[PDB]
Design an enzyme around this catalytic site. Structure first.
Site, PDB file in Angstrom:
ATOM      1  N   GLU A   1      86.442  57.577  10.852  1.00 50.57           N
ATOM      2  CA  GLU A   1      85.324  58.513  10.886  1.00 50.57           C
ATOM      3  C   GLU A   1      84.757  58.780   9.499  1.00 50.57           C
ATOM      4  O   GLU A   1      83.593  58.461   9.240  1.00 50.57           O
ATOM      5  CB  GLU A   1      85.768  59.830  11.534  1.00 50.57           C
ATOM      6  CG  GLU A   1      85.428  59.943  13.004  1.00 50.57           C
ATOM      7  CD  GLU A   1      86.078  58.859  13.831  1.00 50.57           C
ATOM      8  OE1 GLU A   1      87.174  58.403  13.448  1.00 50.57           O
ATOM      9  OE2 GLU A   1      85.494  58.463  14.861  1.00 50.57           O
TER      10      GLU A   1
ATOM     11  N   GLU B   1      98.386  98.028  -3.510  1.00 49.30           N
ATOM     12  CA  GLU B   1      97.820  99.236  -2.930  1.00 49.30           C
ATOM     13  C   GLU B   1      96.739  99.825  -3.819  1.00 49.30           C
ATOM     14  O   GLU B   1      95.651 100.162  -3.335  1.00 49.30           O
ATOM     15  CB  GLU B   1      98.920 100.277  -2.692  1.00 49.30           C
ATOM     16  CG  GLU B   1     100.262  99.678  -2.337  1.00 49.30           C
ATOM     17  CD  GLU B   1     101.168 100.661  -1.630  1.00 49.30           C
ATOM     18  OE1 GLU B   1     101.424 101.748  -2.188  1.00 49.30           O
ATOM     19  OE2 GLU B   1     101.641 100.335  -0.521  1.00 49.30           O
TER      20      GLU B   1
HETATM   21 MG   LIG Z   1     102.579 103.170  -5.072  1.00 45.58          MG
END
Ligand SMILES: [Mg+2]
Ligand SMILES: Nc1ncnc2c1ncn2[C@@H]1O[C@H](COP(=O)(O)OP(=O)(O)OP(=O)(O)O)[C@@H](O)[C@H]1O
Ligand SMILES: Nc1ncnc2c1ncn2[C@@H]1O[C@H](COP(=O)(O)OP(=O)(O)OP(=O)(O)O)[C@@H](O)[C@H]1O
Ligand SMILES: Nc1ncnc2c1ncn2[C@@H]1O[C@H](COP(=O)(O)OP(=O)(O)OP(=O)(O)O)[C@@H](O)[C@H]1O
Ligand SMILES: Nc1ncnc2c1ncn2[C@@H]1O[C@H](COP(=O)(O)OP(=O)(O)O)[C@@H](O)[C@H]1O
Ligand SMILES: Nc1ncnc2c1ncn2[C@@H]1O[C@H](COP(=O)(O)OP(=O)(O)O)[C@@H](O)[C@H]1O
Ligand SMILES: Nc1ncnc2c1ncn2[C@@H]1O[C@H](COP(=O)(O)OP(=O)(O)O)[C@@H](O)[C@H]1O
Ligand SMILES: [Mg+2]
Ligand SMILES: [Mg+2]
Lengths: 485, 485, 485
Positions: free
Chosen positions: B63, B304
């Site tokens: 292909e 965080e």
């Molecule tokens: Mg922390």
């Protein structure tokens, strides 16, 4: 002779997941069930190309008539007829004619390719969108024939050197990528549009399965279809950079500000969690009132109480939200969490923030938004909201109703506490058969905060934070034990 | 006349799972859905062969055009055109020609085999890669015909004595190994590449199902595709041997070092667990500050808090991370856990460690990385990080946010405590209605450590570890009971 | 030349989810399993058109004879024969004739289209409904032929300019949208009717999958089939606007009214939760008695106790519900939660409220309605009831039986506390081996409320709320500890 260049699509969030757009001079496969936005994606691709880069586009339709395509595009504010009249867009009508009878021979893909090449040469097209090649290939029931014809089409469009978007078909959301199963392997690039049905709710997600010779963000990414077309949100817009400041902002409760070491931070997220009736909405109302008293714009995203109920409670607490709204300082958006998906709520929040340009935002009861949604999707939504608020230097106040009313051993059952900067723990305290309340600044990053679990009472003037229960043990359990002296 | 020799592939992690590479003079089956890296695996096989052992390779494509293969390989920094010009690589174009019409007779596999043999003899090829034999066999709808043709191809390539890699196709991730179901049984060796979709995230895994006549590591192993090709990680790189030393390293808190019997060990893993706001990030910041004050390089993997928020909190704690970064001693990598999979995060950590050569590393909030991932995958990731850090003699400091804020009856709900050497338990202690904190050295292998649950306060100067609650009972519950005298 | 106009269907709740109805001059696909209401939807579409806008409609049937269609429509009070006699409705009988033998040639869709066009021109029809095109296409086993014929039909009906509703077929509730799988992609608009079987109960839901060129509410929405046809309830009728007032309403217990700061609010929701035997039904009975003593209409939706048992208990408590019913002031609807689905219960509540026009409503034991239903469906039902009651300015009193009888750490395991305005916590308190009860006003938005956990006894005169346990600790645990002095 060079690396794999990409062509931006300017579809909000697509260029980010595709790391620069669709590869230039190649065919991209857009597969999805009915109503997934394949036609919308293909149309937006050409429209954005023409409008932002002056790149003429070609649209090949096999079912939707050109008139219907133009009529469809207007719902997004796109005047495709203007582009057609200007020669910038050409809609190649390849739909079977009703007067044309059935043909037992293999459909002439060569004639279609020649027509597309002629149109590309005539309009100097750089972009091509092919609508429902599956309608073409259903006459080609054999899968091998389908793979061969797709290979011929892709190779020819590649030799012409145009960037192509081919929309294909699937029966199941998580089944074969395409109908025959040969479409996703002949194409260099595969994009999957899904309309997953979960909890009687439809969740639309876009996935870039493969970009041959280029890196791309992996997995499903939620996207919505609004009056501006497809809007994709790549996993909270990654990290970015928001220079946090030490500027303080008042909470509306001077004693709480003292408890926080001088109030909340401007570029921080505040989370007031507690049982029902603890006064989270009261803190939100005082927060908004302080925001507006300083002639600063604010928004209140409520999800439990109606607008009028909020008005009544605020008036009972000596807060006139009606005058605030009249002054153009407060905009109250209340809506049931079910009314729309988490991606839709995020889009509404972003749009409201953009239109109003608030300095503070207060979302009432994140727990309400967590109803009936997976913890992962909820977490993604909170990441999005927090990141967007921090990027605009907006102070965010979020409330979370704890599922347990006393003895709550966790701040949040959804565990969003890791994402928030300031945490206000509100809880009931049984004292002499009376259900007193207690407010504690559980957490504050970058600031000293009072460790005292301070009693507070709710009056017509608002919250009055009193001294701490300094003669009691196990307050946190809700049922403390008193000690003499 | 001899045992089953193997040919190294030099694909990172493949030779380990295959116990020396692919068997020599045999055909290996590489099966996987679209976007699983089959073409990448086949190309990397030949490229590594040529570059590391000067073994000419043959690529058979059905292909992807040769030009497109060369253009694809550059994303990994591979100049296949240079190899072709040098005669070391030959891309045999076997794709159907657009000008060639359909053939009703069985496709001539004999002609393809003769062409491959001629190319092998001309270039003295030792390695062969076959791209999408499924495209060849779709014209062979019958499964028996497909098995027969695969058998002929494998037997001929075996008689020629070349090591072959054949890429085949599948519709489902965990369904039939290949499309027809006869491909995996004619081949001597079967490799399965998967792109499992779990939690709206794509997880790429490689599995060696069978190596006839040789042992191999069993099951799925995660792997990533980056600017260097396929990178497989065999189950934490087994055990290895890292000679642990008695060298002590300061934690940045002299009282904590005293609590640890002279600080942490250089070749050890430290785990600071506790509720939100307990000061895990503060301990990480002091750890990094101590690392850099001694002119030692360190990295802070946060998941965080943003970079600027970390900067602001550190400055509030008297720590100047900006000066540390300017000196080239600190590199802060923060990123949302969702942005990439656990394998991707492990690869990023390994790459950063290699580029910087740090003496200490601090990963913030392993719990953040555990969001929405199975406990087994998370555990595998922690094993990988801990082993890699211990191998380089790097001191690791990891933080884990406990889901329950008081009464936490477990160190970690993910149970990673069994893997860590030092455990610092941080918890809130209710005392006279005030939420004091408590730090305890829960665990320390090979060192005496203070058993005292010592109070500490967080000030602008950092943590100040005070005496222990020696007049209280049930501190661990969070709500202790005081006793007179 | 203009935007996508829509044609209202006037089907209760459909126009809301479709944002104005079905697009004008286009074909809408209504797919669903047997008994999903496809024929009912198509018939109601034409009937509502004719009756509300004087738009003549055409019905094309392939199985149900016209006589049977007219006979069917009468169950909803619709006299289709009157419309046929008036020339406003025409039922085109296209069902195969029994005397007509099988035809080996492709069925003449052209003849059917010509007949439909002739009928549209003769009756000036603006609306068309097509019943079971699948019966037509089963003779067209091939899926490609089916797609082609559907395309011809849709294109012709579009050229005629009539709004069309086509009912198609499916085998599985969550499988392919239609039988062949080509029906949902040729149609511009797709509506899915489901009869999901969950917990041995059939839940009927309607979903608008796609409205090409227009926005629509996404996902499944429950709907019922009653004597008025299809009744859809879009996710609690969104928010709306109900101007809450400060008007007070007595609870029937003067001491409780004092505890609430002057009784409950008229436009508020009261939730009395507690263990079995705590007296929730007593509070409901006193609430209804106070409602009727003021010559105000009230309804009591019970789901645990029979009518006569409620009568007996009320008489034992000095309340004469029989005289109340005779005066036309009280209507008691009791019914087992299983007897019908949550949507059916919501419809019954709405109908009763409309017929009686009550000032207060009291639903007994929401927990009973939560039996065997998903938390999401239950929450949707509570949202619906609360919103409907608040919209009509109706005071709602709901009871929820706590699953745990002492130590209940949560107000409601279904977490409906976030939706209620007033929360009355009823619990047992162990005192000297006697199981005393305690009533506490846990929550009251917009009003001061007594924090006292007050003892109350149940007598023949009703509840007598006594003082609070001011010499006890851990009352909330159910087992308090007494302290001297
Ligand atoms: Mg922390
Ligand atoms: N202005 C708009 N705002 C929001 N959603 C819209 C808007 N216009 C269209 N939509 C939605 O977008 C979808 C349109 O899908 P689209 O026609 O692009 O292709 P598809 O559904 O992938 O394939 P098919 O061709 O089978 O319809 C519909 O489901 C519709 O709900
Ligand atoms: N430089 C790169 N860095 C990271 N990922 C890459 C890079 N180049 C390619 N990829 C990824 O590798 C994949 C390429 O797969 P590959 O072409 O090798 O074969 P396959 O997907 O098994 O089969 P098919 O031939 O059907 O595409 C893509 O999904 C793409 O995302
Ligand atoms: N007056 C009525 N009140 C309540 N339910 C009714 C009433 N009349 C009919 N029904 C219900 O409505 C359904 C009728 O479905 P309808 O004939 O409209 O189409 P369908 O079930 O989608 O398709 P099919 O043509 O295969 O029956 C039945 O399941 C029946 O229970
Ligand atoms: N005028 C008032 N005087 C004293 N308390 C009041 C007054 N108005 C409302 N309250 C108190 O406010 C509480 C509601 O607080 P709110 O912020 O809505 O709780 P949540 O945590 O659910 O958001 C009521 O339970 C009641 O105790
Ligand atoms: N200048 C300061 N003085 C005293 N305490 C502070 C100061 N700055 C931050 N803190 C404390 O630091 C805590 C954050 O600690 P951190 O290490 O971020 O917690 P985590 O365990 O979530 O990583 C805040 O909750 C607050 O108690
Ligand atoms: N005449 C009476 N005198 C005192 N107590 C009674 C009398 N009649 C019923 N009770 C009390 O009423 C309780 C039932 O209260 P009810 O409101 O039905 O509870 P629930 O919370 O289950 O609705 C009984 O358990 C009993 O304690
Ligand atoms: Mg609230
Ligand atoms: Mg009861």
């Amino acid at each position: 002779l060079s690396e794999v260049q990409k062509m931006p699509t300017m579809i909000e969030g697509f260029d980010d997941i595709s790391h620069g757009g669709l590869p230039t001079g190649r065919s991209t496969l857009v597969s999805g069930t009915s109503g997934t936005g394949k036609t919308l994606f293909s149309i937006q691709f050409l429209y954005n190309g023409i409008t932002e880069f002056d790149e003429p586009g070609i649209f090949v339709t096999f079912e939707e008539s050109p008139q219907d395509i133009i009529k469809n595009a207007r719902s997004f504010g796109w005047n495709l007829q203007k582009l057609v009249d200007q020669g910038k867009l050409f809609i190649l009508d390849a739909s079977p004619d009703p007067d044309g009878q059935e043909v037992a021979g293999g459909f002439d893909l060569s004639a279609l390719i020649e027509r597309i090449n002629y149109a590309i040469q005539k309009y100097k097209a750089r972009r091509v969108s092919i609508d429902s090649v599956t309608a073409v290939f259903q006459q080609y029931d054999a899968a091998s024939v389908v793979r061969r014809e797709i290979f011929r089409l892709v190779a020819r469009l590649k030799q012409i050197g145009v960037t192509t978007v081919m929309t294909t078909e699937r029966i199941d959301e998580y089944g074969p990528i395409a109908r025959y199963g040969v479409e996703e392997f002949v194409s260099d690039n595969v994009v999957i549009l899904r309309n997953v049905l979960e909890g009687e709710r439809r969740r639309r997600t876009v996935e870039i399965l493969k970009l041959r010779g280029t890196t791309h963000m992996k997995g499903e990414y939620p996207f919505t279809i609004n009056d501006h077309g497809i809007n994709i949100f790549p996993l909270g817009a990654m990290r970015l950079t928001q220079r946090s400041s030490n500027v303080r902002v008042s909470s509306g409760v001077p004693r709480l500000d003292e408890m926080c070491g001088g109030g909340f931070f401007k570029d921080s997220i505040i989370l007031a969690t507690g049982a029902t009736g603890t006064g989270k909405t009261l803190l939100v109302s005082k927060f908004i009132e302080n925001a507006c008293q300083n002639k600063e714009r604010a928004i209140l995203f409520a999800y439990e109480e109606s607008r009028a109920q909020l008005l009544r409670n605020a008036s009972s607490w000596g807060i006139d939200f009606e005058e605030m709204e009249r002054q153009g300082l407060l905009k109250i958006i209340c809506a049931y969490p079910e009314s729309a998906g988490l991606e839709d709520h995020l889009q509404i929040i972003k749009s409201e923030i953009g239109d109003f340009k608030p300095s503070r935002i207060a979302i009432d009861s994140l727990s309400a938004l967590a109803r009936g949604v997976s913890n992962n999707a909820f977490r993604q939504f909170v990441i999005g909201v927090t990141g967007y608020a921090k990027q605009e230097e907006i102070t965010g106040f979020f409330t979370n109703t704890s599922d347990q009313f006393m003895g709550s051993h966790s701040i949040t059952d959804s565990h969003i506490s890791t994402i928030t900067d300031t945490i206000l723990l509100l809880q009931y305290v049984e004292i002499r058969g009376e259900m007193s309340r207690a407010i504690n600044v559980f957490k504050m990053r970058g600031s000293w905060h009072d460790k005292g679990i301070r009693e507070y009472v709710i009056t017509d003037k608002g919250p009055e934070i009193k001294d701490s229960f300094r003669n009691f043990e196990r307050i946190i359990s809700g049922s403390p034990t008193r000690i003499t002296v």
